[PDB]
């Protein structure tokens, strides 16, 4: 086939990153390692670190929308009660 257009990812040998010099990487065989090392420390301290960093972003909009939903639900329950018909007619028409 013909060659296609220029991409941003080559293959093994010509990926297309910059030239690399002076970076040395070391690694050990997994057969010589301990998997599940540090699971009981990461399960309590790392989990708390990640939760402390990323919970206001998730739980402030969740609190806003859940309070909005509960308030609208309470108003809909009030409007179709015996105590709140006399607002329901002047509310809908």
């Amino acid at each position: 086939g013909p060659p296609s257009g220029k991409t941003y990812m080559g293959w093994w040998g010509h990926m297309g990153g910059p030239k690399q010099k002076g970076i040395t990487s070391y690694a050990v065989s997994p057969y010589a390692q301990k998997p599940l090392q540090g699971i009981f420390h990461n399960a309590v301290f790392n989990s708390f670190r990640r939760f402390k960093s990323q919970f206001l972003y998730v739980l402030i909009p969740a609190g806003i929308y859940w309070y909005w939903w509960k308030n609208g639900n309470e108003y809909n329950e009030f409007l179709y009660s015996k105590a709140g018909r006399e607002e329901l007619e002047r509310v809908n028409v």
Binding site: Y26, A27, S29
Partner: protein, 431 residues
Amino acid sequence: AEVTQLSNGIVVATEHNPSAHTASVGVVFGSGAANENPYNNGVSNLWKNIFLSKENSAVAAKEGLALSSNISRDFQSYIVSSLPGSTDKSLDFLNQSFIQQKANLLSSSNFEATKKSVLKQVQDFEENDHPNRVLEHLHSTAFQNTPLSLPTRGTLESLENLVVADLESFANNHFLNSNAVVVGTGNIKHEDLVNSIESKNLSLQTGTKPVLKKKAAFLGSEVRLRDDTLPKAWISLAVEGEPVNSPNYFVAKLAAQIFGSYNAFEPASRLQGIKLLDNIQEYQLCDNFNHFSLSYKDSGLWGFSTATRNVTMIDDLIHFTLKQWNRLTISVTDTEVERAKSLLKLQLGQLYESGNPVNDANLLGAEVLIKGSKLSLGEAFKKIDAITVKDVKAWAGKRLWDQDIAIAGTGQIEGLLDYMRIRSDMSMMRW
């Protein structure tokens, strides 16, 4: 052939060869770079190079003596070779400047010049000699945090903290009568060497070397000193092999000789009887390879090294050579064993039986130092001829089949896959 005797403190070993025209004596210690810290790494290189200073070698040149020395993992030797009539001039030189009066060698303004040239030497090693520096990095990642992990030349960061106190401390701790063989090769006879080493009352030192607190342990690992500005990709890759005084020593040598060495640019290196060549020749996967079996005192190494410019197909070169290694466990033939037998006998004959008596001195010194005697070449040939296919299959099931490997690479090794794919290549799924 070899004869070996024990004086008051010194063991003496000679290989007399009456058809040689040079004789060569020297002393081989038993503490190479495997007896150093990571902090005095390069002491044996500095002793090698202050034994070969210009003012130490001018004195030998005025008497017609040529100095030589060798630093290895286990041993280190200091050899003085000359004409056959002047063996006692050599023994006198080796005594009066290396053994007893080493205070002129360790002069400052000699130590500074030698340390400067050794620093320049290892700086030009670390950035220009690529296959040997990845063999040293294979050693430094296979045996890490154990004493066999140290480069024999030392390290530029280590070598620039050394002073003369470190050299003389190592000299006190290791240059001992209990640690040394006095070798003689060429046409020096044994009775004349013992008569002239008891004629002079030569004594080196009287202590005993420190015994290392941990043995060398093979750790399956990897190291990647990648550098995209180099033309080729140099990759060494090895398993834990046999140390010396194994029973599987010659089986490891034979199993490395089965896959042999290869050069892409020599036309009689393409016609060898290796079944790896008709897998790596069709797309020209490599420039060269060589299969080694490095044996030390503690541990060993068995593997290969390649240099290739086909940086897009490194992983298939590795895959094809490891799938050729699997055949040693499963389906190595009779013919490959016979061919490797003949080629191994030829290789050992060219290594031992060679004209140079410096090399014979190094080999005899290390062999007699590690096992008290030297195996003759006829007995080595009778031990090579007795290897069967079942011995190769048993050895490869023990040491090769599904074992951890050590990898070292420099250059353009982006195409080299990770540890786990290469390690999973070490055992095929029985097809």
